[PDB]
Design a protein around this ligand. Sequence first.
Ligand SMILES: [Fe+3]
Ligand SMILES: [Fe+3]
Ligand SMILES: [Fe+3]
Ligand SMILES: [Fe+3]
Ligand code: NA
Lengths: 315, 316
Amino acid sequence: MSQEFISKMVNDLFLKGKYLPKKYVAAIISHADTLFRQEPSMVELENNSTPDVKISVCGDTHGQFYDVLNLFRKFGKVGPKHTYLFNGDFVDRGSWSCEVALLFYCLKILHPNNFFLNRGNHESDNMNKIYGFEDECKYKYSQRIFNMFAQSFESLPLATLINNDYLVMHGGLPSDPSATLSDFKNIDRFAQPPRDGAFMELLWADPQEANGMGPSQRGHAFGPDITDRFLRNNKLRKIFRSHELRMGGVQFEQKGKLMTVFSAPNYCDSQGNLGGVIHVVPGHGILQAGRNDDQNLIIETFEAVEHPDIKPMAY
Amino acid sequence: MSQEFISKMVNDLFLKGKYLPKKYVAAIISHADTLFRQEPSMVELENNSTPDVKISVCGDTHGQFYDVLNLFRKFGKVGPKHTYLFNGDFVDRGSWSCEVALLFYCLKILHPNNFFLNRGNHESDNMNKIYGFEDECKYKYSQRIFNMFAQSFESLPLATLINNDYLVMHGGLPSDPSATLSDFKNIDRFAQPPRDGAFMELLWADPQEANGMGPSQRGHAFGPDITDRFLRNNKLRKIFRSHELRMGGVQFEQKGKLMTVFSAPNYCDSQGNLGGVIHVVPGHGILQAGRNDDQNLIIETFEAVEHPDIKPMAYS
Ligand SMILES: [Fe+3]
Ligand SMILES: [Fe+3]
Ligand SMILES: [Fe+3]
Ligand SMILES: [Fe+3]
Ligand code: NA
């Protein structure tokens, strides 16, 4: 694996609407799978000690390869100076789910210490059957290749902690006031998300602005009182999560205790929304009234880009 | 991965009729899969340069965990002084196919340079469906774990070459007089065995003592004239292969040009056969009239051992 390999794959193959030989796909899915399996259920990251490493957090990409690429061209390439985290939901809906999954896997292999993924609710069997990926995968490669992706999904961490300040999961928090970091750490993640419990809430829960807890519009809703309690109990600053569309790519929520970052711009070729990113860069933050109250954070946004004459879920 | 990890797995888990947590199985199958996938379709091994590394070749084990263990207790453990190669057909028929697959995978991870596998015809979807592994795997673990094993099978090399003298595949040779080592080397192996072709012949063909080629008792039969031609064309000494039972564990065949090693003793709790092994140890061979004519080879054999009150294919 080399940057050379990714460039040819991206430029020579995926941008000409060609697929990788099935032997490479398998090698990639398998090497990525092995890497993530060595990782704890909650990855712990820091750049306090390494001043000039920028950590970026991105949200849903839902197989929008062309925006992912743009995201990379605008915000910079993954490297020793530049870690990234994708907070799940990178497959389904978009019609280049395989191409995103594969870049991410390659990147994981090439920069195992500068590239990170949380599982999102769509990196699951139930979701892929319904929402696109399975069909796209079977069409482009095979049932066996799909199974390989599906297995790899069980290996993805459920949450990632940054600078002991920010906790990041695709969905939200459990409403259990007992819940702690070590609870998330010890989760038996190599399986499908369960019906109830913190495993599913990490992947399914949405915040609300009302206090308390309740059923969501679609797991559960959790109010700013639940977030606050969790943050102070666990010596954190904020929650970052994704799982919901935000017209402005990232949204400052729950009186600052929470941010949603969503990185699938003009979602479903329809929403005309921005995608977002959250640089954690300690002490070089850029404050804005109503968007960022933290001196370690830069919030940027990005617009959708053109993509080939293909529908969403074209498979 | 450590020898510690294998010993607990073997002794504390598999010998008490318990299974590994599904998370370990997946990790193991996946780390082994990755390792083999880095390997060429024909692996090339040598101990000429490293005098005191013994290379052992074994044949079919068909999920007979207890004899595999014994094999290791008799012949010695895999290590920097002691490479091993299993020549396929380690799953199916025997009722501890998962346990053998898993030791082999662990061993591959622990000694990636001292442990080697050729794919055998049973390390395929068609065979596992019919012959036991799929049922055993689904019963003990899950469909997903079975698929993981199945995928890993596509990564296993099709042949292995030793000291540029001995060529080792599970089944046999193609009858194509063009066939060369580089032909085997360049095979797109990550797939199921095809209907015709050198891919399938490496895994399915049987030798015969009559000259020429023909349909086998079950791919094709290949005579001593085909072997000889292949050996001299390719600057080799012998073929080693497995895929057939031999009452004496290893058999010297085709006027010395070929040997069958088979390492599943008392096959199907029925045959009362010996299992075999072929040490290649350059210049410390032990010659026997009618068994070994090569000063680089030691042929040993081993007897079957007791195993728990379980039938063969107790899950099919
Ligand atoms: Fe989503
Ligand atoms: Fe989601
Ligand atoms: Fe066999
Ligand atoms: Fe066989
Ligand atoms: Na792997």
